[PDB]
Amino acid sequence: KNPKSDKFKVKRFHHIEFWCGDATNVARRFSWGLGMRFSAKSDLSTGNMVHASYLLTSGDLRFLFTAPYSPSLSAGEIKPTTTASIPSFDHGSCRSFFSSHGLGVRAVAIEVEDAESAFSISVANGAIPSSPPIVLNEAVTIAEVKLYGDVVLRYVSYKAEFLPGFERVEDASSFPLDYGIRRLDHAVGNVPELGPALTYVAGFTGFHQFAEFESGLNSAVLASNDEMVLLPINEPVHGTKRKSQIQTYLEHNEGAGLQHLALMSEDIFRTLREMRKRSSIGGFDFMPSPPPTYYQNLKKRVGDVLSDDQIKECEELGILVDRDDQGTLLQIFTKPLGDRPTIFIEIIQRVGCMMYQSGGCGGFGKGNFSELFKSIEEYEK
Amino acid sequence: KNPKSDKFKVKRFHHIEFWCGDATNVARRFSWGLGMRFSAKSDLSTGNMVHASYLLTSGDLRFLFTAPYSPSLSAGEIKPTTTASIPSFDHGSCRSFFSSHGLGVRAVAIEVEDAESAFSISVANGAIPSSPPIVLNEAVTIAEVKLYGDVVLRYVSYKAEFLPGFERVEDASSFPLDYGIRRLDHAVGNVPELGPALTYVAGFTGFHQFAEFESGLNSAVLASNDEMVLLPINEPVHGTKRKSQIQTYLEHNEGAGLQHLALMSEDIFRTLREMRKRSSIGGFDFMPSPPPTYYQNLKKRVGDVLSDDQIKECEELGILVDRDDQGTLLQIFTKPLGDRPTIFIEIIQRVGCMMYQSGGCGGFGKGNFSELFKSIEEYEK
Ligand SMILES: O=C1CCCC(O)=C1C(=O)c1ccc2c(c1)N(Cc1ccc(C(F)(F)F)cc1)C(=O)CS2
Ligand SMILES: O=C1CCCC(O)=C1C(=O)c1ccc2c(c1)N(Cc1ccc(C(F)(F)F)cc1)C(=O)CS2
Ligand SMILES: [Co+2]
Ligand SMILES: [Co+2]
């Protein structure tokens, strides 16, 4: 059931912004590890005396990396005279965020029809304001409300190239890397209490709960009208045999925040081949692969969707598979992206639900909790 | 002239430590960009609840990258019960350093015969103490005095594997990258006033001034007894036509600090081939190359040291060449390593002064100031 209750018109995920101590090194690491090209910049070379911001793209996926300069460079500015290209940026907020949480997502940005309206309607319906609507070069409007922890939900709307004040990156510095990643599928938050977090976010967005089908979590998913914006939220379950890794997240992150970004690939086999080639030469590492019993058990579960060779290809790459009532999911998870056991990345490709593919086809992999345990005990043998 | 006036026995450069906001991403970027292997770690997985520290090595060159965890992880510890492997580390100092300066060098570490003696003699001769001598596992002693700005000169001495509490990195995570870099040749600081900085450092070390042979700087070089530890220092020259980039450094860095690290290569052609292949895929960028007139003029200057093809190879890679009375220098410079126009890297190889090669053979390239200007005006033509 989908009541289509959005309180304002939402389009798609637009970008994800990381707050960094040094944007250059994080962006260069992520570019090589994920196959994303350098697409836009706003920094000293474009007249921005406030923050360094670098944009990576792969298909429609947009990762923004931002770090503050010395405040002394902009000490004479006021907001009316700012050289910052992102008017919501604040040196103190950024330093406090990074000192508190380490490297992580500050903003989950969605494109909307009218960011000013989205902001006003959100706040009228309980959203905590974070940055008011600001019109950039009479062309783009940006606004921000609190999502959870120190993560903001950012609204961007365009009258008609990322943001005014950003410059497209010279061809020489823009190597055309591409490992097949094409868009953000979903963005997941960890909170201490799922109930109040859901009530808050669904309260100000009108997002509805997305249909689903001992491991230390309870989760639910909020979705926009066409279910293309997907915001799962997890809470820890206490007193379990193994300590909840949602709780470990909350401790190491100093509270609620973004747990993982799931990136859709148009060819998850190619994406994982390319990412795994680079794991130990600057890229990303992956979680340990499931035992062979897991891939033996895939025959019974998805033998009508994947051939033997395609299943063997999943085994070679450590890819997980899940299925719900409408579709099939291929997924795999990275180790944490930085020093802390907090944020990680999921790579996903979905099979089925063709009408374009409908959002969330195959679910989010909750069936793999039981299938992994069963596989581990069976391989124990 | 070399008076050999060291006040304590100094051996070689031992390591350089960067203070980071996220050590993982900087280390992975540097590893790929410079061809350095992951060699040791001290972090949550080794029982360190205080800081994440990752060691990269190439030959004898050792780069350490360190970032603080949440203080809450170690809030019950005191110094007698610390789980930090580097006892001089302090969360507040590290966060303050990185917020003030951005990514940069905190420690220039030299191996000495007796770090406790080196510390005591240094302080008795004017050194400002930063961290007292601490004996680690009855095997290594570490001590720190202020060098310039917030950079410390770190003394390490071994009774007899980086530091106790560090673990060697698993083979799978340790890809054997190598682009030919073999050791730290020299480490250069920028200060507002060269005179007082030289008097201070030479005062507490006994290091002597190293023999040399409009551009915005005055510089001098301090050297140990065998001139293998080399510490140049620059000050800005004001009122020049082009603003001194020493002064730009001081402004963007919020004061004095480490300007560049010069890394000796055993094959600078191979090093530059490998680094330039990776510039736009996560590695380091290089300064713009000199005009062809510069390489035409190399015939007269070093035609007795390099063949035509070797000179042409220099031109293909943008390598600079200088010569003093004893030897010849090949050098090239990266663009800044991070967001701020502050720290950069030099790659160097020296030709001559064979007895082993004596330290500083060929100088530091000061002749390239005039040779570059002349080349630029001649190519203007
Ligand atoms: O989990 C949820 C809730 C719903 C919205 C969401 O998108 C997801 C996932 O993406 C997801 C689903 C199933 C699995 C999985 C991730 N993971 C990674 C992993 C390890 C550990 C823990 C934790 F310790 F926190 F419980 C959670 C996740 C696997 O390794 C195979 S099972
Ligand atoms: O400079 C010094 C002093 C002595 C100890 C030292 O090791 C060095 C060098 O390594 C060195 C020497 C000559 C050159 C050079 C670097 N560089 C980079 C560069 C650009 C700009 C400015 C500045 F703007 F600050 F003046 C300084 C340096 C070149 O590009 C070719 S000339
Ligand atoms: Co997921
Ligand atoms: Co130099």
mmCIF file with all atom_site columns, all heavy atoms in Angstrom, chain A residues 186 188 260 262 333 346 364, ligand 3:
data_model
loop_
_atom_site.group_PDB
_atom_site.id
_atom_site.type_symbol
_atom_site.label_atom_id
_atom_site.label_alt_id
_atom_site.label_comp_id
_atom_site.label_asym_id
_atom_site.label_entity_id
_atom_site.label_seq_id
_atom_site.pdbx_PDB_ins_code
_atom_site.Cartn_x
_atom_site.Cartn_y
_atom_site.Cartn_z
_atom_site.occupancy
_atom_site.B_iso_or_equiv
_atom_site.pdbx_formal_charge
_atom_site.auth_seq_id
_atom_site.auth_comp_id
_atom_site.auth_asym_id
_atom_site.auth_atom_id
_atom_site.pdbx_PDB_model_num
ATOM   1  N  N   . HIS A 1 186 ? 19.517 4.229  -1.842 1.00 0.00 ? 186 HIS A N   1
ATOM   2  C  CA  . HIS A 1 186 ? 18.940 4.572  -0.546 1.00 0.00 ? 186 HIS A CA  1
ATOM   3  C  C   . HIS A 1 186 ? 20.038 5.026  0.409  1.00 0.00 ? 186 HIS A C   1
ATOM   4  O  O   . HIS A 1 186 ? 21.225 4.754  0.210  1.00 0.00 ? 186 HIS A O   1
ATOM   5  C  CB  . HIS A 1 186 ? 18.106 3.415  0.049  1.00 0.00 ? 186 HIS A CB  1
ATOM   6  C  CG  . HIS A 1 186 ? 18.847 2.129  0.281  1.00 0.00 ? 186 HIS A CG  1
ATOM   7  N  ND1 . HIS A 1 186 ? 18.949 1.138  -0.675 1.00 0.00 ? 186 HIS A ND1 1
ATOM   8  C  CD2 . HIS A 1 186 ? 19.465 1.645  1.386  1.00 0.00 ? 186 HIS A CD2 1
ATOM   9  C  CE1 . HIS A 1 186 ? 19.596 0.103  -0.171 1.00 0.00 ? 186 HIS A CE1 1
ATOM   10 N  NE2 . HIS A 1 186 ? 19.945 0.393  1.072  1.00 0.00 ? 186 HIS A NE2 1
ATOM   11 N  N   . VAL A 1 188 ? 20.737 5.428  4.663  1.00 0.00 ? 188 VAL A N   1
ATOM   12 C  CA  . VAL A 1 188 ? 20.278 4.787  5.890  1.00 0.00 ? 188 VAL A CA  1
ATOM   13 C  C   . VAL A 1 188 ? 20.854 5.514  7.095  1.00 0.00 ? 188 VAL A C   1
ATOM   14 O  O   . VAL A 1 188 ? 22.066 5.754  7.161  1.00 0.00 ? 188 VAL A O   1
ATOM   15 C  CB  . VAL A 1 188 ? 20.695 3.308  5.920  1.00 0.00 ? 188 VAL A CB  1
ATOM   16 C  CG1 . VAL A 1 188 ? 20.236 2.659  7.229  1.00 0.00 ? 188 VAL A CG1 1
ATOM   17 C  CG2 . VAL A 1 188 ? 20.126 2.578  4.692  1.00 0.00 ? 188 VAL A CG2 1
ATOM   18 N  N   . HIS A 1 260 ? 24.735 4.024  6.163  1.00 0.00 ? 260 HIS A N   1
ATOM   19 C  CA  . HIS A 1 260 ? 25.301 3.610  4.886  1.00 0.00 ? 260 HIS A CA  1
ATOM   20 C  C   . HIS A 1 260 ? 24.578 4.239  3.706  1.00 0.00 ? 260 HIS A C   1
ATOM   21 O  O   . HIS A 1 260 ? 23.418 4.656  3.786  1.00 0.00 ? 260 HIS A O   1
ATOM   22 C  CB  . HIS A 1 260 ? 25.387 2.067  4.748  1.00 0.00 ? 260 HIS A CB  1
ATOM   23 C  CG  . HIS A 1 260 ? 24.096 1.341  4.487  1.00 0.00 ? 260 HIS A CG  1
ATOM   24 N  ND1 . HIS A 1 260 ? 23.295 0.859  5.501  1.00 0.00 ? 260 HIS A ND1 1
ATOM   25 C  CD2 . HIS A 1 260 ? 23.539 0.901  3.332  1.00 0.00 ? 260 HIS A CD2 1
ATOM   26 C  CE1 . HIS A 1 260 ? 22.277 0.194  4.981  1.00 0.00 ? 260 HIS A CE1 1
ATOM   27 N  NE2 . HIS A 1 260 ? 22.400 0.206  3.665  1.00 0.00 ? 260 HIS A NE2 1
ATOM   28 N  N   . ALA A 1 262 ? 23.679 3.262  -0.212 1.00 0.00 ? 262 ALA A N   1
ATOM   29 C  CA  . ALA A 1 262 ? 23.581 2.158  -1.157 1.00 0.00 ? 262 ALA A CA  1
ATOM   30 C  C   . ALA A 1 262 ? 23.574 2.733  -2.561 1.00 0.00 ? 262 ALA A C   1
ATOM   31 O  O   . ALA A 1 262 ? 22.681 3.512  -2.908 1.00 0.00 ? 262 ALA A O   1
ATOM   32 C  CB  . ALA A 1 262 ? 22.329 1.328  -0.911 1.00 0.00 ? 262 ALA A CB  1
ATOM   33 N  N   . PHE A 1 333 ? 28.751 -5.151 0.730  1.00 0.00 ? 333 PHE A N   1
ATOM   34 C  CA  . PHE A 1 333 ? 29.010 -4.072 1.669  1.00 0.00 ? 333 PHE A CA  1
ATOM   35 C  C   . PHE A 1 333 ? 30.501 -3.856 1.847  1.00 0.00 ? 333 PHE A C   1
ATOM   36 O  O   . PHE A 1 333 ? 31.269 -4.818 1.963  1.00 0.00 ? 333 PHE A O   1
ATOM   37 C  CB  . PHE A 1 333 ? 28.348 -4.381 3.010  1.00 0.00 ? 333 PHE A CB  1
ATOM   38 C  CG  . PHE A 1 333 ? 26.858 -4.453 2.909  1.00 0.00 ? 333 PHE A CG  1
ATOM   39 C  CD1 . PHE A 1 333 ? 26.230 -5.647 2.592  1.00 0.00 ? 333 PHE A CD1 1
ATOM   40 C  CD2 . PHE A 1 333 ? 26.091 -3.320 3.086  1.00 0.00 ? 333 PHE A CD2 1
ATOM   41 C  CE1 . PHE A 1 333 ? 24.860 -5.712 2.476  1.00 0.00 ? 333 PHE A CE1 1
ATOM   42 C  CE2 . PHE A 1 333 ? 24.710 -3.378 2.970  1.00 0.00 ? 333 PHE A CE2 1
ATOM   43 C  CZ  . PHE A 1 333 ? 24.101 -4.572 2.653  1.00 0.00 ? 333 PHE A CZ  1
ATOM   44 N  N   . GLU A 1 346 ? 27.150 0.376  0.477  1.00 0.00 ? 346 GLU A N   1
ATOM   45 C  CA  . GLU A 1 346 ? 26.580 -0.812 -0.130 1.00 0.00 ? 346 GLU A CA  1
ATOM   46 C  C   . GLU A 1 346 ? 26.556 -0.605 -1.634 1.00 0.00 ? 346 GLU A C   1
ATOM   47 O  O   . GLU A 1 346 ? 26.246 0.490  -2.108 1.00 0.00 ? 346 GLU A O   1
ATOM   48 C  CB  . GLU A 1 346 ? 25.163 -1.036 0.404  1.00 0.00 ? 346 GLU A CB  1
ATOM   49 C  CG  . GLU A 1 346 ? 24.395 -2.158 -0.244 1.00 0.00 ? 346 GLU A CG  1
ATOM   50 C  CD  . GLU A 1 346 ? 23.011 -2.300 0.355  1.00 0.00 ? 346 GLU A CD  1
ATOM   51 O  OE1 . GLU A 1 346 ? 22.671 -1.536 1.292  1.00 0.00 ? 346 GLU A OE1 1
ATOM   52 O  OE2 . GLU A 1 346 ? 22.259 -3.178 -0.108 1.00 0.00 ? 346 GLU A OE2 1
ATOM   53 N  N   . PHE A 1 364 ? 15.567 -4.753 0.808  1.00 0.00 ? 364 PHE A N   1
ATOM   54 C  CA  . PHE A 1 364 ? 16.825 -4.207 1.297  1.00 0.00 ? 364 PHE A CA  1
ATOM   55 C  C   . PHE A 1 364 ? 17.753 -5.290 1.839  1.00 0.00 ? 364 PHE A C   1
ATOM   56 O  O   . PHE A 1 364 ? 18.830 -4.971 2.358  1.00 0.00 ? 364 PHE A O   1
ATOM   57 C  CB  . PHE A 1 364 ? 16.533 -3.120 2.340  1.00 0.00 ? 364 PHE A CB  1
ATOM   58 C  CG  . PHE A 1 364 ? 15.741 -1.976 1.769  1.00 0.00 ? 364 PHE A CG  1
ATOM   59 C  CD1 . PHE A 1 364 ? 14.350 -2.025 1.732  1.00 0.00 ? 364 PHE A CD1 1
ATOM   60 C  CD2 . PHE A 1 364 ? 16.381 -0.884 1.208  1.00 0.00 ? 364 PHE A CD2 1
ATOM   61 C  CE1 . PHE A 1 364 ? 13.622 -0.990 1.175  1.00 0.00 ? 364 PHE A CE1 1
ATOM   62 C  CE2 . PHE A 1 364 ? 15.657 0.153  0.645  1.00 0.00 ? 364 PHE A CE2 1
ATOM   63 C  CZ  . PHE A 1 364 ? 14.272 0.099  0.630  1.00 0.00 ? 364 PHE A CZ  1
HETATM 64 CO CO  . CO  C 2 .   ? 20.980 -1.194 2.438  1.00 0.00 ? 3   CO  C CO  1
#
